[PDB]
Design an enzyme around this catalytic site. Structure first.
Site, short mmCIF file in Angstrom:
data_model
loop_
_atom_site.label_atom_id
_atom_site.label_comp_id
_atom_site.label_asym_id
_atom_site.label_seq_id
_atom_site.Cartn_x
_atom_site.Cartn_y
_atom_site.Cartn_z
CG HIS A 128 -2.12 -1.04 1.10
ND1 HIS A 128 -2.85 -1.37 0.26
CD2 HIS A 128 -2.24 -2.23 2.09
CE1 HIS A 128 -3.47 -2.38 0.38
NE2 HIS A 128 -3.06 -2.94 1.46
CE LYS B 123 20.74 -6.89 -16.42
NZ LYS B 123 19.61 -7.81 -17.42
N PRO B 124 22.60 -3.18 -12.77
CG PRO B 124 25.06 -3.39 -13.35
CD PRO B 124 23.64 -4.21 -12.88
CG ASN C 125 17.42 -4.68 -18.17
OD1 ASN C 125 17.93 -5.92 -18.27
ND2 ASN C 125 16.13 -4.62 -18.52
CE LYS D 186 28.39 -3.24 -25.53
NZ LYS D 186 27.51 -2.82 -24.31
NE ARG E 88 22.84 2.93 -19.99
CZ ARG E 88 24.01 2.34 -20.47
NH1 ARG E 88 25.01 1.89 -19.70
NH2 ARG E 88 23.63 1.95 -21.76
CG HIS F 286 23.01 -11.66 -23.31
ND1 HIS F 286 23.92 -10.93 -23.64
CD2 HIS F 286 22.86 -11.86 -21.86
CE1 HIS F 286 24.63 -10.23 -22.72
NE2 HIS F 286 24.04 -10.83 -21.53
CG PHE F 287 19.56 -6.11 -24.94
CD1 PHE F 287 20.62 -4.99 -24.79
CD2 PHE F 287 18.60 -5.81 -25.70
CE1 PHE F 287 20.54 -3.89 -25.39
CE2 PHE F 287 18.49 -4.86 -26.50
CZ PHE F 287 19.39 -3.62 -26.22
CG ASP F 288 26.58 -8.29 -26.90
OD1 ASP F 288 26.71 -8.89 -25.74
OD2 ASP F 288 27.34 -7.61 -27.79
N1 LIG Z 1 22.45 -1.30 -23.41
C1 LIG Z 1 22.47 -2.25 -22.66
C2 LIG Z 1 23.97 -2.96 -22.22
C3 LIG Z 1 23.81 -4.16 -21.60
N2 LIG Z 1 22.73 -4.62 -21.02
C4 LIG Z 1 23.14 -5.92 -20.25
O1 LIG Z 1 23.76 -5.60 -19.19
C5 LIG Z 1 24.23 -7.02 -18.61
C6 LIG Z 1 25.51 -7.41 -18.85
O2 LIG Z 1 25.95 -6.75 -19.93
C7 LIG Z 1 23.08 -7.92 -19.33
O3 LIG Z 1 22.45 -8.63 -18.38
P1 LIG Z 1 22.63 -10.06 -17.99
O4 LIG Z 1 24.00 -10.52 -18.57
O5 LIG Z 1 22.73 -10.26 -16.45
O6 LIG Z 1 21.42 -10.96 -18.65
C8 LIG Z 1 22.17 -7.08 -20.17
O7 LIG Z 1 21.59 -7.74 -21.39
C9 LIG Z 1 21.49 -4.16 -21.46
O8 LIG Z 1 20.49 -4.65 -21.12
N3 LIG Z 1 21.54 -2.96 -22.08
N1 LIG Z 2 -10.15 0.96 -1.97
C1 LIG Z 2 -9.66 -0.23 -1.50
C2 LIG Z 2 -10.34 -1.14 -1.15
C3 LIG Z 2 -10.09 -2.39 -0.65
N2 LIG Z 2 -8.65 -2.82 -0.68
C4 LIG Z 2 -8.55 -4.10 -0.16
O1 LIG Z 2 -9.08 -5.03 -0.99
C5 LIG Z 2 -8.66 -6.36 -0.54
C6 LIG Z 2 -9.77 -6.86 0.28
O2 LIG Z 2 -10.73 -5.84 0.80
C7 LIG Z 2 -7.60 -6.06 0.71
O3 LIG Z 2 -6.44 -6.85 0.57
P1 LIG Z 2 -6.20 -8.11 1.45
O4 LIG Z 2 -7.53 -8.46 2.11
O5 LIG Z 2 -5.81 -9.05 0.34
O6 LIG Z 2 -5.05 -7.73 2.15
C8 LIG Z 2 -7.24 -4.57 0.35
O7 LIG Z 2 -6.76 -4.12 1.67
C9 LIG Z 2 -7.81 -1.72 -1.34
O8 LIG Z 2 -6.60 -1.92 -1.56
N3 LIG Z 2 -8.30 -0.57 -1.73
#
Ligand SMILES: Nc1ccn([C@H]2O[C@H](CO)[C@@H](OP(=O)(O)O)[C@@H]2O)c(=O)n1
Ligand SMILES: Nc1ccn([C@H]2O[C@H](CO)[C@@H](OP(=O)(O)O)[C@@H]2O)c(=O)n1
Lengths: 124, 124
Positions: free
Chosen positions: B12, B41-42, B44, B66, B85, B119-121
């Site tokens: 909430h 994650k630094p 993405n 890379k 970033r 993978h995103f490079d």
């Molecule tokens: N511009 C960029 C450069 C790198 N990245 C990447 O930054 C991480 C390492 O380069 C990658 O995540 P993972 O390898 O953890 O999947 C991710 O693909 C990105 O998402 N966008």
């Molecule tokens: N305006 C509203 C009305 C109800 N609720 C609620 O809707 C759910 C059921 O009333 C509640 O979650 P939980 O009971 O699962 O914690 C939550 O507090 C809300 O988050 N906002």
């Protein structure tokens, strides 16, 4: 184990959304805050006031809880909140929400010592 | 077990003046897409083009990854992407990101059968 293809889609694909959208907030936040796992939580409110201000509601106006407990409190002032409601098209695991920016009083249940918000009851 | 107080904060609380701002896209997305668990994650990139266009890159311009792997491909055209970033102030578990919308060529590694992005490079 998650496939590399699926991992790439998770980490790098957002074909279905605009990063400049204001209305995608609930979709992202409900996901981020783990309320879209197992099922889509149908209704949830996020509060944008300070944690201190929200905690302070526990010392404000005592009101009826929707569930009939006697531990609910209403904020003295309206607060900036976001209402998230599951859309008609939403179907798990594709949870979709309507985001509404609202300023309403919040009602929270308080518990613990110190007494702090433990349940979001309603916005009115 | 998650405390009731913590559960309320997770479900909430999103304190701030502009929660739905486009400037917050990376903060929300990196969280939602599970890249802020354990560490931030630094860097993405999210791609806003159709998955068909991204998959098509695997049949486009061959380039060396890379990291020296030889299964990378550069997109023939630029794509609408969002660069995420970490800010200088970002510190786990409070991950913070600068969101930048750019149009750049993407470089992805392609693998599996069918050969798809795994993978995103880089973006160039
Ligand atoms: N511009 C960029 C450069 C790198 N990245 C990447 O930054 C991480 C390492 O380069 C990658 O995540 P993972 O390898 O953890 O999947 C991710 O693909 C990105 O998402 N966008
Ligand atoms: N305006 C509203 C009305 C109800 N609720 C609620 O809707 C759910 C059921 O009333 C509640 O979650 P939980 O009971 O699962 O914690 C939550 O507090 C809300 O988050 N906002």
């Amino acid at each position: 184990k998650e496939s590399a293809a699926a991992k790439f889609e998770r980490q790098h694909m957002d074909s279905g959304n605009s990063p400049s959208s204001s209305s995608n907030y609930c979709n992202l936040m409900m996901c981020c805050r783990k309320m879209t796992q197992g099922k889509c939580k149908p209704v949830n409110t996020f509060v944008h006031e300070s944690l201190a201000d929200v905690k302070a509601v526990c010392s404000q106006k005592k009101v009826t809880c929707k569930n009939g407990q006697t531990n609910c409190y209403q904020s003295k002032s309206t607060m900036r909140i976001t209402d998230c409601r599951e859309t008609g098209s939403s179907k798990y695991p594709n949870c979709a929400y309507k985001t509404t920016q609202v300023e309403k009083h919040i009602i929270v249940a308080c518990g613990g010592k110190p007494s702090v918000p433990v349940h979001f009851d309603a916005s009115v």
